[PDB]
Structures are given as C-alpha cells and as structure tokens.
Design a protein around this nucleic acid. Structure first.
Lengths: 103, 91, 97, 80, 93, 108, 80, 97
DNA sequence: CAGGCACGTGTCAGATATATACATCCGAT
DNA sequence: ATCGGATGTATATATCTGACACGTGCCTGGAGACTAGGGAGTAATCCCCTTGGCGGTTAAAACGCGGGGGACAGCGCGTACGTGCGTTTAAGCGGTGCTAGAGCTGTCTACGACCAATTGAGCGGCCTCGGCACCGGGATTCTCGAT
DNA sequence: ATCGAGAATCCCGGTGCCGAGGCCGCTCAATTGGTCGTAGACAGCTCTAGCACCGCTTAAACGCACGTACGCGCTGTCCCCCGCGTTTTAACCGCCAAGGGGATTACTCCCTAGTCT
C-alpha cells in the first residue's frame, strides 16, 4: 500500500512528495522524483550511520553522541567535502597537532 | 511536529542492530536530512526553470544529485536512486 | 621543587581540549555580551536560552577555525608564537576583510 | 549593559587557542580576538533581530539564529 | 524570439543622472546581469521569508525585510526609503 | 473604459512594474504576490542601478571618456565600500583589477 | 588532445602574477599554477558538461558555464 | 649599454598589466586545454565560443586573485619572491584544501 | 484507513568517586 | 646514554540516575478510484553556427649569458611569555515568584486569483555620423652610472 | 647630494572605422473592468517560560615571581631569477566550405492535479 514499501525504502515517499508539492519548487512534481529523493536521503543517512557506528565502537561506547558524528564526518574524504561549511553542535574538533610544535 | 525520528532510527537498526543514538545526536541527523533535502530540491527547481520546464521528474533529481554530492558518493546515490524507481514502477 | 619545561604543559591542554567537547567560555558573561550587543538594534528584547546557546556554539566554532588558520599563518612565517598580524592575514585571505 | 566584552577573559581565549592547536600566544591576541568576536556577534545578531522583528515577535528564538547563521554560510546543526 | 531585457530601463536611468553620458553594449549587458542577479537575490530571500512564517503571499513587508538583510549599511537605509516612497505614491495614484 | 496609465507611472518609477510582477508570479517564489511588492522591488532596483551608474559616470569622466565601459563599472564598484561588499563574490567581464602595489615592493 | 597544459606558458603566468602585483616569481611557481588552473578547470567543466547533458544537448553554451560558475559562488557577469 | 636594475622593469610590468583589461593567456592554447579537459567527461563535444571566453575570463580572474593572496602570504613571511608554499598556504586558508 | 505523533513507564548505559597500575618528563650523572 | 623521582594518564570496581527505548491511545495525513486537460514527447524542417583546413605576418615564446640582490644559515641578545603559587571574584546551582508574551481559535472582510476586451510600449530591422582606436611626432619625466 | 645621457611615457594633432543611438513597423503583454474564494488581520483566551531575586559553595580568574627560550636584528654566502639580445614558431587574421544540431512549429497522448472516500 505505502509507496515506501512499494519502492523498498524506509524513508517516507508520501511525506517527501507532500514537501515537494508545498515546497513551491515547481508547478508540477513527477511521480518518481519523491522516490528518487527518498532513496538518496536513505543512502546518505545509512552512510552517516555506518561511519558514526564505527566511530562509536572505536570509543568503547554503544550509543552515538554528536562527537561520534563529527569524527565520522571529518574522517571521511568526501563527507567532509559535502559538509565542509557545517558546524555540528557539541561536535568538538578533530585532534591534530602540527609537527613543528612537537619537541 | 513532524520529523524523521522514526525513519532515521529504522535505518540505524539495519546498519548497526545494537548501537543506539542519543537525543542530541539524533536531532543533528534531522537537521542534516532537511539540509540535504533543500539542496537537491532547490537545485532541481532551478533545473526546471533553466530548461523552461514546469515539472520536476526523476531526471532533475538525478542531475541535482550529481551536481551536489562529490564523485564517488554521487555514483552510489544515483545507483540507489535508480534502483528504487525501477522497483517502484514494476510494483 | 620541580618545574616543567616551557611548552610541555602548553603542548598539553591541546590534547585535552581537542578531545574535550565542552564550551570553554563562561555562559553568563557571554549572555551579557549578547544582550549588550543586541540592545543597540532593539530595546527591551527578550532572548531564548537555546538562542544564546546556538550563538555560543557558532561563535566558539568560528573562533576555533580562525585560530587554526592563525596557527598555520604563524608557522608559515617560521614562528611558534601567534601575533595579531597572523589573525589579520588569515582574515584578509578568508575574505572577511 | 556596559563593558561586557571583557567578560571574555584571557584564559577563555587561551583555551580556545589550545583547542585550535596553538602553543604560544602573544599579549595582543587577547584584544584582537575580542574585536573579531564582537564584529562576528554584531553581524549575526543584526540579522537575527531583523528576522525576529519581521516575525512580529519580541523574543529572539533559536530558529532566527539558525537562519541568520545559514545566511552567512555557517550552517549549524542541532537547534532546528 | 522576443527576448526580454532591461536595456530600455537602464538607459532611461542613465539619462537623468548623467544626461551626456553613453554606455556600450559590453557595459550594458553587465548591468542586465546585475539587475537579474539582485532580482533573484531579493525575491529568493523574500520567498524563504514567507515560508519561515508559514505565509502564502509576498507583500511589500517581505520585500522590505529582504532588502534590509541583503543590502549593507547605508545602501539598505536609502533603498528602504526609496521603496516606501514609491508604495505611498502608488497607493494614492 | 479609461485611459491606460502604466503602473510604473503611477509610482513615479522608471523600471517596469508589470514586468517585475509577471516575473515574480512566474518565478515560483510563492503562491500569491501582493500588489505593492513589484512596486517596492522596482523602486529598489532602480535605486541600485542609479547608484551604480552615478559612480560609473564619474569614473568615465575621470578618464575623459563619454561612454561607459566595463572598466568604469569595475572601478566604481571596487572603489565604493558598500558596493564592494554587495558584489564581493562577482567577476565582471573585461573589468580588470584595481591598481594596488604593496608598499614593500616599492623601491627604496 | 594531450599535454595542452604546457600551452599555459611561463610568460602568461608571469603576466598574471604581474597583474596580481607580484614582483619576483620563483621557478617552481609555473608548475603549481598550471596544476591549480587544471584543477579549477576540471571542477568548472564537470558542472558545465552536466548542465549540457541534462538538456539533451551536445554543445556547451555560455549559459552552462555561467550557471556552473554561479554554483561555486563565482557569479560571473557579462556573458548571458 | 644601459641596463635597468632588476626591480624597475618588474614594477613597470605590474603597472602596465594592472592598468589594462586584456586577456593574458593566449586563446587557442587555452581552448585546446579546455577541450582536452572536457574529453574526459563526454566525447565529441562542440564548445560554443562564448563559453570558452567565459571560461578564460573566470579562470584568469581566479588566478589573479590567487596570485594576490600568494603575494600577501609572501610578504607576511618577510619575503619578496613568491614560492609554491605561499600558494599552498593561500589555498589552505581559503578552503580549497 | 493505518501509520506516526503525544503521553506514560521500566531500566540499564553512562557519569562520578576512589584506589591501583603505568607511560612520560626532568634533573643530574 | 641513564637512572631514579615525580608528576599526570589509563584502568578496574562500586554506586546511583535520568535519558532511551518501548507500549498505548488516537486522528489526520497518506492511499486508492476516477476524471479532465494541458505539459511534454515525437516528427519534420531551416539556417546558423561550429568545425576543419589553408596561407601569410609577425608578435610572442624559447634559449643563452651575465650578475646583482634576495633567500637562507648562523650568532647573539633581551624581553616577553610560559609555569607555579597564593588570593579574590564571580559563575554555577538550587530554590522562589511573576507576569509579558508566544501560541492557538473564531469571524469576516478586503485582497489577490482569474477571465474577457483593449491598446500602447518594447523589440526587431535598418541607417549614420560621432566617439574612440591608431599612428606619427614632439615635449616630459624617470632611471642609473658617474662624481 | 647632484647631473646629464638615455629610455619610457604623456600629449597634441590628424585620420579612419563601426556601433550607439535614433527612427519606423508591429505585435502581445500590460491595463481595465468585473466576479469570487479565502488569507490573514484582529479580538480573545491560555499557559509557559523568560526575567528577576536571594543564598551558598567552590572553581576559575587574577596578580605576582621567576626563569628561559624564542623573536628579532645583524652579518656572511651564494645561487638563482631578472634583464637583455638572438632565434625560432605558432598564435592570429583572413578566407572558404560543409554539415550537425539548436531552435522552431504541428500533432497527439498520457501524467499529474484535483476531488471524493
């Protein structure tokens, strides 16, 4: 029945379709556009959650905090480029010391 | 209000069936989803106007994905997006 | 007694605050500064606590990034100490000036 | 509300520099940092108050700060 | 086909601030790019401004606030006064 | 009926009001567009154009030229501080750069 | 087409540095400048080609380049 | 024979190329480089001349701005000659690395 | 029409305090 | 190198505790059917604009040869900035009150969407002379080896 | 701290070029005049959270003492980049020709908005 299950996703196709309609983006919204956008959003969320889960397990924790998300984003080559101009609240900074300051 | 709390948590349980998520970390996930949503939808809206079109279809979402996401990240996002549309049409 | 060599404790607390995720700025002085700045635009203006917290996070992140750029500029000039000329160079290159 | 820019004490600036990976600090940094922080805060709060006034409100919500930061290119996650 | 441009409008403005000064095709196409840039800049901010407050109409109030956000310092103070002066004249024919 | 008198003339402006209204309506900015919004936007655009053209003509006369070239627009924009901040991320075709040599490079 | 990066000759980079206000230029500047120019050109042309392909066209018009530049915040005036 | 001292002719060229608005990169080599770069993304592309001109002007403006930032970085380090490390520092602070 | 959002509730991952082991710095040597 | 003394980090265990993940109820936002009309796919066509090639000029690039000035390494100095200790200030942290104002509902009215005539303003075609590019020569100003 | 030879630069005049501006014809989009649905402006009520106050506790800021190491000035080496003259060489202008596809108009059909449940 639901379009999300008809497409094999977990993100809401109907909600994305409604947001596209109210969005004022265009006069008409196609049928496959919400499905495609929901699939893209699901893939990106899955990648973030994979890297964050690995970062959380490296710290002997079983729960994700913003620090793990920040570490996952900064330690990935391309996720850093995608969210370069984004500040994560309670994310901290990547531990890095220049070699010249070291004794 | 409306959020992606139910949907994000489902994706996590598929990816890490034992790891959980805190309230403040998970709100950051919500703000991320709306940020990417407006990036692709905003870029796709310009593509229709640029080509004198009035409809947003799968061809405009696909091009917006290639424009925003970097090289290797965009290639799988297109593959995941294309797969869902074909399955949706068949079913 | 014993006295640590200069720079060793200075090399420490980098390893603390790069692993710590606190605010490092006192909250009430920042709140007072925000209110003092904001009264110039509109008097009798009320602030949400989340608004002040968001302002604090954004300001601190901006200052941290500016200090990293300042450190890079200072190292570029074959120096270890950071001078305000390095802050001015970083801000000029970044487009703020 | 007077002279609260000095509320940003010297040790706070040293702590921020240490998080930024700075080993040694000169004496004029503790004033240059206050100046640049004041400029940034004025720039953000002007837009935040503009949004608040447009919304016919007397309370500066966190969403106004989020919008003002997103306008300057500094997108912030965690507050909406 | 029938392309649309601000060439007539820019030229009229030129002849009142500088009655004896011309403009080249290269220079005038830049002025067309500037106007289209600012038009999209102000209207985009106003469009977001109405969506933020869950509104459905773009009024002069939304355009005024967008001008106050985009234009810096004195450039915004004079633009607002010019904008409000036209609206009052228009409202009274 | 009655004599047609254009909306731009009712407001005293030179920039079009009907064209701006049409572009706002067909730009997918909002569901509805108010009556005074095109008038306000046209007034703002006319003010900005006049402000730039004033300095552009000043630069043109300073070079003993009667016509305006992209160099004059470049000079006018970069010389004014507020116009510079407004258009700081804009590249002007055939505009060149502002003459500025650092003092240390100047010969002793 | 191959090795056309060397078409950006040393005198051209020298003139660009002179317009930028550089008095003395090191020997290793030219290769770095050629690499930076190549990276920037690939970055812009990728988006321009994407815009061209989405329109089912085979010619890269000036508007595609203008839109690709505006996407990266360059916002070129003039053409289109 | 009359030979100018090294500083003078450089400054003369600086003034000459700051007074003008010409394109300093040749046109056919730049067009060939653009076509080579565009071969990787899609074969058999037909560039419109105005697109190549816009690319040349944008690239030239970018290079001029980068060289300005490089010059300021060089002067910051008590130097006159620009070095590739100056370009690297400018690009790193600007956010391109 | 049913899934997703208020509302309520058990409970255990995590913060804190204290004792113990130990990788690291520094002055002679 | 080296060896011991002494700080500041990891690690293990007890001990709370308050967010986290899960039931529970409910209603409104998503789904399924059906209809109509305009957006877009497809065919066909014209011309214009991009590409390819050839020939001649010549300005620009490549190369070589001094040689002087700037980059870089080494030395010395002094003073400004860390590190530690005692003292003072105010920032959290816990309660209380108290009221301005953000937020949610109910009318209803002016305002914007929309459609049918109506016509003038802006755009395409096409001159034409004047601003501007170019050259030729002379007067002016800056530079550098010499006192 | 000047001085003249020499080279680069500004200016003044004359000549030719092409495009900026003005005019004319003509559409089609802006204007008027109406109807009509509904967005939000306003009045009203609620609760809630932002502001103010007070008392306690102790963590952090501050001021000072002191040593030391690093920023800065100076000097010496040397090497490499710039100025200038000679030799290619390929950019550039002009011209010609061919065809690929980028805009256009016609026709149709089916995808999506709208309404109901």
């Amino acid at each position: 029945k639901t379009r999300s299950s008809r497409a094999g996703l977990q993100f809401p196709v109907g909600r994305v379709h409604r947001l596209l309609r109210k969005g004022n983006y265009a006069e008409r919204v196609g049928a496959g556009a919400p499905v495609y956008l929901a699939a893209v959003l699901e893939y990106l969320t899955a990648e973030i959650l994979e890297l964050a889960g690995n970062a959380a397990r490296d710290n002997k924790k079983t729960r994700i905090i913003p620090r793990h998300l920040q570490l996952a984003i900064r330690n990935d080559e391309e996720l850093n480029k995608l969210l370069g101009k984004v500040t994560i609240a309670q994310g901290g900074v990547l531990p890095n010391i220049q070699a010249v300051l070291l004794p | 209000k409306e959020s992606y709390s139910v949907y994000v948590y489902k994706v996590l349980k598929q990816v890490h069936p034992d790891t959980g998520i805190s309230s403040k970390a998970m709100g950051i996930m919500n703000s991320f989803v709306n940020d990417i949503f407006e990036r692709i939808a905003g870029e796709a809206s310009r593509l229709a106007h640029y080509n004198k079109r009035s409809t947003i279809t799968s061809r405009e979402i696909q091009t917006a994905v290639r424009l925003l996401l970097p090289g290797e990240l965009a290639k799988h996002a297109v593959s995941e997006g294309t797969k869902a549309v074909t399955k949706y049409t068949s079913s | 007694p014993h006295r640590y060599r200069p720079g060793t404790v200075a090399l420490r607390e980098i390893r603390r605050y790069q692993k710590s995720t606190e605010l490092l700025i006192r909250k009430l002085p920042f709140q007072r500064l925000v209110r003092e700045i904001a009264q110039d635009f509109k008097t009798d203006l009320r602030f949400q606590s989340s608004a002040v917290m968001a302002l604090q996070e954004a300001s601190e992140a901006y200052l941290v990034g500016l200090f990293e750029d300042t450190n890079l500029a200072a190292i570029h000039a074959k120096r270890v100490t950071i001078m305000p000329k390095d802050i001015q160079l970083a801000r000029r290159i970044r487009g703020e000036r | 509300l007077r002279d609260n820019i000095q509320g940003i004490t010297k040790p706070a600036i040293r702590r921020l520099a240490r998080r930024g990976g700075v080993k040694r600090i000169s004496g004029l940094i503790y004033e240059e940092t206050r100046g640049v922080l004041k400029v940034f805060l004025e720039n953000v709060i002007r837009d935040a108050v503009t949004y608040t006034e447009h919304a016919k409100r007397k309370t500066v919500t966190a969403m106004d700060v989020v919008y003002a930061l997103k306008r300057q290119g500094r997108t912030l996650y965690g507050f909406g």
